[PDB]
Design a protein around this ligand. Structure first.
Ligand SMILES: [Cl-]
Ligand SMILES: [Cl-]
Ligand SMILES: [K+]
Ligand SMILES: [K+]
Lengths: 89, 89
């Protein structure tokens, strides 16, 4: 039951996940997902966006994403509400 | 470095993986990946095809796929040659 997403979503979205700042840079159908830890280290993962099936892969972890204007909402596959991450550009 | 794949690849592809028969049924941008074990049980996983980034997700495992006419070649992300699966319709 995937809802297809807008295909043009270029930009830089930020938000929080477990107190770490997330920065998602999107270009075309790919991007980078960067997690800033409290000590200043960053973890950078490659992202790919599958717009027709509403899937975003970061590194090799599969998420569901939803685009609402400047906001991208990232969910686990089970849609666990406590794992939801909202990013905004 | 993803090469974009043809978007119309409907059909039923079969092959082998570790002596199990794989049957991949593709419809639009989704499909089912079925593994037949030697005892007759089957394992069925949902598949999604991301054509622009050349990614296929089965269940929640990420693969790279390549379409050559009636043949679909499925690779691990590291492209380990011993993990390659060739399916044909
Ligand atoms: Cl939108
Ligand atoms: Cl082809
Ligand atoms: K926007
Ligand atoms: K074909």
């Amino acid at each position: 039951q995937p809802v297809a997403q807008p295909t043009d979503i270029d930009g830089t979205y930020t938000g929080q996940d477990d107190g770490d700042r997330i920065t998602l840079v999107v270009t075309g159908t790919t991007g980078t997902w960067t997690e800033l830890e409290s000590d200043g280290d960053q973890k950078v993962k490659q992202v790919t966006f599958d717009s027709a099936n509403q899937r975003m892969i970061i590194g090799d972890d599969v998420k569901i994403y939803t685009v609402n204007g400047n906001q991208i909402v990232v969910d686990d596959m089970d849609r666990d509400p406590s794992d939801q991450i909202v990013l905004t550009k």
